[PDB]
């Protein structure tokens with residue numbers, strides 16, 4: 001027996017469910033950057049997909065159990081992180097991971113410095129193949145909204161910068177010419193909202209942090225955006241923030257979530273607040289309604305989606 005269902009959205013006179021696509025470099029980037037936004041939309045019935053460009057084979061590992069999986073040892077961390085990503089996405093309401101070009105196609109490029117005995121690094125990949133692979137995904141899923149890193153790739157990791165480059169080119173090529181062309185309605189860059197981070201970090205209390213963690217300072221955040229530079233914000237509810245916390249917890253080899261779930265830290269022990277609001281810059285398409293801050297409050301703003309019956 002097929003379970004009874006109801007179409008939740010209409011776009012004009014046709015039932016049409018919003019589709020969003022987030023493109024990230026490594027496993028856990030989706031949770032750290034857009035976890036609350038993804039959970040926000042999936043819980044509202046929107047179809048959300050996450051594309052991860054690499055397995056994150058060059059990552060470090062927290063703890064001793066999986067320490068020998070690192071690249072300088074057994075070099076099997078990428079395969080192990082597939083499970084962490086799968087569990088993280090499930091926590092956010094996303095079905096399964098989507099690896100660009102197939103899982104294992106292009107390797108984590110690393111943060112530069114260490115060995116690099118690899119003939120398949122994402123940053124060194126032929127744009128014809130990477131852009132081609134992403135175009136196929138975009139034409140298949142036909143996303144109303146695509147999200148990726150800004151030109152500086154957030155912190156500046158080589159793979160984040162490259163993800164921006166490939167996604168930008170793919171969005172541009174997707175509608176020119178899983179076969180028919182598709183022009184993406186809205187294209188955003190996920191960015192760090194400086195003012196939100198500041199108040200968020202200051203609001204953290206002793207029990208939210210482990211004794212060895214330290215809150216970041218100015219010279220540790222040179223890629224934040226001012227409220228003037230931000231174009232949109234998704235202010236999710238506590239349910240969505242809780243899903244983000246759960247997603248982060250799933251990336252056990254990369255992140256440590258505080259005892260109260262209000263903060264988390266990476267291997268560098270740099271504690272960051274786990275906030276419900278995530279910020280964006282409109283990179284392509286026309287914006288919907290803006291609030292008093294001059295920000296849209298829904299990535300789907302202006303696309304004409306309405307709840308069925310309204």
Ligand SMILES: CCCCCCCCO[C@@H]1O[C@H](CO)[C@@H](O)[C@H](O)[C@H]1O
Nearest residue numbers: 008043044045298300301305306307
């Ligand atoms: C149990 C989950 C119920 C989800 C009901 C879907 C609510 C949809 O709500 C609609 O979403 C659109 C796009 O975000 C907005 O533009 C509309 O203003 C809003 O009413």
